[PDB]
Amino acid sequence: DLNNAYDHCKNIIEKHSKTFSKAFAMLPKHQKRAVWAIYAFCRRADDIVDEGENPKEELEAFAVEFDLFMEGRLETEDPCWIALQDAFERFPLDPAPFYEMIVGQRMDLYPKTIDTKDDLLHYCYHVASTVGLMLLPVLAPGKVSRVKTGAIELGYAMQITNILRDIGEDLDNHRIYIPKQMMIEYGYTRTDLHNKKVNEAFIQLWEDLAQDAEHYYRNALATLPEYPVYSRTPVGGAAKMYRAIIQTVRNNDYQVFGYVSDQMKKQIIAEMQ
Amino acid sequence: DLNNAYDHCKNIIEKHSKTFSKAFAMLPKHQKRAVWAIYAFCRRADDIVDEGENPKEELEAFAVEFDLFMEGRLETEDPCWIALQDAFERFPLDPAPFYEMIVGQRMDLYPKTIDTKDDLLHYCYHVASTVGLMLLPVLAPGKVSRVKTGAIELGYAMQITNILRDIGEDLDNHRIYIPKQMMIEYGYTRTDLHNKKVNEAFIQLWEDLAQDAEHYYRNALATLPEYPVYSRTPVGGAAKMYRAIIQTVRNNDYQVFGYVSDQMKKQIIAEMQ
Numbered sequence: 001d002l003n004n005a006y007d008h009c010k011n012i013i014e015k016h017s018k019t020f021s022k023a024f025a026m027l028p029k030h031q032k033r034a035v036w037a038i039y040a041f042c043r044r045a046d047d048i049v050d051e052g053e054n055p056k057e058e059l060e061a062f063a064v065e066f067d068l069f070m071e072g073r074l075e076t077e078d079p080c081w082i083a084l085q086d087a088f089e090r091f092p093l094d095p096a097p098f099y100e101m102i103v104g105q106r107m108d109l110y111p112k113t114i115d116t117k118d119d120l121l122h123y124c125y126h127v128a129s130t131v132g133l134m135l136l137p138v139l140a141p142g143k144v145s146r147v148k149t150g151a152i153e154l155g156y157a158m159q160i161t162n163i164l165r166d167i168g169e170d171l172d173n174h175r176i177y178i179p180k181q182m183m184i185e186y187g188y189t190r191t192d193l194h195n196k197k198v199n200e201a202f203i204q205l206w207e208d209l210a211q212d213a214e215h216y217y218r219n220a221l222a223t224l225p226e227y228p229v230y231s232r233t234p235v236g237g238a239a240k241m242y243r244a245i246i247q248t249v250r251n252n253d254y255q256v257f258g259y260v261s262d263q264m265k266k267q268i269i270a271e272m273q
Numbered sequence: 274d275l276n277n278a279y280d281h282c283k284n285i286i287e288k289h290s291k292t293f294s295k296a297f298a299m300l301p302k303h304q305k306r307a308v309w310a311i312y313a314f315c316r317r318a319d320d321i322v323d324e325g326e327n328p329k330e331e332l333e334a335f336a337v338e339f340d341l342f343m344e345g346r347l348e349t350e351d352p353c354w355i356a357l358q359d360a361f362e363r364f365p366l367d368p369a370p371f372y373e374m375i376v377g378q379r380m381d382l383y384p385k386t387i388d389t390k391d392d393l394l395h396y397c398y399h400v401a402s403t404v405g406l407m408l409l410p411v412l413a414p415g416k417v418s419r420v421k422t423g424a425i426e427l428g429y430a431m432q433i434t435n436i437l438r439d440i441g442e443d444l445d446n447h448r449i450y451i452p453k454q455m456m457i458e459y460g461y462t463r464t465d466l467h468n469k470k471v472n473e474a475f476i477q478l479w480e481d482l483a484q485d486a487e488h489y490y491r492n493a494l495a496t497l498p499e500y501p502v503y504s505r506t507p508v509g510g511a512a513k514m515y516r517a518i519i520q521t522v523r524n525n526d527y528q529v530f531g532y533v534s535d536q537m538k539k540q541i542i543a544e545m546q
């Protein structure tokens with residue numbers, strides 16, 4: 001039934017993102033549950049692409065399930081779809097960012113060809129900004145249009161942050177998200193990258209992106225007063241638990257070729273309060 | 274002196290390309306020597322990028338030496354520059370493809386962002402077709418304009434062939450030259466590639482490119498009668514020693530994630546005769 005389907009999504013978010021599970025555990029009941037179901041959609045699609053053996057076939061099957069879902073023709077025992085069906089019935093969730101997140105995950109089926117910062121922002125929009133857009137009707141009922149730009153920019157901030165701390169892990173998987181034109185601009189070579197070398201050129205490039213992320217975090221945090229009261233600490237705390245990674249990397253001399261404990265998360269959420 | 278400078282380039286080509294050294298050892302003396310010096314220019318630039326510790330600094334220094342060379346202001350003991358200076362003084366070598374090869378090697382200082390076949394041909398033009406263009410005044414004196422298109426296409430054929438047999442070695446070095454749009458077209462995923470998997474999608478993609486290479490080889494070989502007699506077996510034999518790789522790969526079930534012995538080279542050159 002519905003309560004058990006959502007409970008399955010609660011376990012998914014608690015297992016895969018203590019950051020978001022702690023942040024949004026404070027939301028009122030039905031909005032909290034919707035967040036769980038929306039997270040589960042994003043987590044399933046991302047896990048298919050990043051950890052599936054036949055990711056393209058499995059993502060096509062997931063996309064077809066979402067097609068059936070949107071036509072009201074999905075018969076399933078999947079708790080994530082059962083919960084999401086209620087969330088869409090209960091709140092004016094917009095299907096567009098759900099479709100666009102699948103487009104983003106399609107991007108990650110193939111090797112990267114990120115040339116410019118605009119290419120990078122296009123990627124971040126589809127795999128991260130869309131998450132913000134999916135959530136907005138439940139985080140800010142009736143106020144979506146006012147907080148929308150900040151939610152897109154929070155997606156940019158968080159995904160740029162992920163990229164900046166995942167350079168080595170991504171490289172090991174033959175994924176490169178650093179824009180080629182920025183490597184040319186700063187003189188950071190593919191051989192430097194392959195050798196996992198931190199040098200002056202790397203630090204200049206890394207700081208360029210990190211300063212853009214910091215700009216986007218500031219813009220997003222400035223919109224917190226426009227959310228309803230129960231979403232302000234959840235959204236601001238989630239933002240600040242991601243942003244914390246940047247100063248840690250700096251304090252680690254930019255060694256990102258290999259960040260926030262649960263107590264540290266609790267501290268960040270209380271500080272935000 | 275000049276004889277020793279060229280002899281140093283003879284040793285370079287004999288050490289790094291038994292294919293080209295055997296092919297062009299049949300050329301008349303002064304044209305043979307020019308080929309050695311031209312090869313040495315290409316080999317030095319490629320070795321800087323592919324095996325140098327600080328490739329960008331070393332390629333900038335090489336480019337500055339070529340700037341001085343072209344102004345007649347290079348004072349050097351480098352036998353490769355001494356030999357090339359005579360080749361430029363002796364034959365109407367065109368500086369343009371030498372500059373363009375340096376542009377191509379600059380491309381390989383950074384990770385690849387090859388999206389389309391046209392992107393791939395652009396790369397092959399600058400790192401391979403340019404070699405053909407550098408050589409044409411010594412392989413076909415007075416007849417450069419007639420054989421030029423075939424020489425560009427031979428560059429495409431040879432470099433596509435290199436890419437098709439180097440997929441694994443390039444992947445290990447975080448280089449991907451397969452066009453992303455072709456991976457999408459045939460359904461060959463980044464995870465497949467990372468896993469070094471040969472599947473139906475890979476074979477379709479590989480054959481698509483191999484058939485383009487075979488087309489370019491046929492066009493190039495059709496121009497052999499327009500070369501002077503002493504270049505026909507050298508150029509045709511070099512072409513056929515590279516082309517041989519394609520059928521071997523097919524006979525090896527497309528296993529290119531890890532080709533022509535010296536006797537096999539001698540056999541191909543005699544067959545071409």
Ligand SMILES: CC(C)=CCC/C(C)=C/CSP(=O)(O)OP(=O)(O)O
Nearest residue numbers: 127128131132151154155158159235
């Ligand atoms: C609360 C609002 C409006 C936005 C916060 C949530 C958001 C943009 C999540 C996307 S971060 P992302 O990188 O896509 O997801 P993970 O890699 O952390 O799993």
Ligand SMILES: CC(C)=CCC/C(C)=C/CSP(=O)(O)OP(=O)(O)O
Nearest residue numbers: 400401404405424427428431432508
């Ligand atoms: C004889 C003519 C006109 C063209 C033949 C030479 C040519 C196009 C050589 C370039 S092959 P390329 O891949 O650039 O060089 P290597 O990787 O084999 O060292």
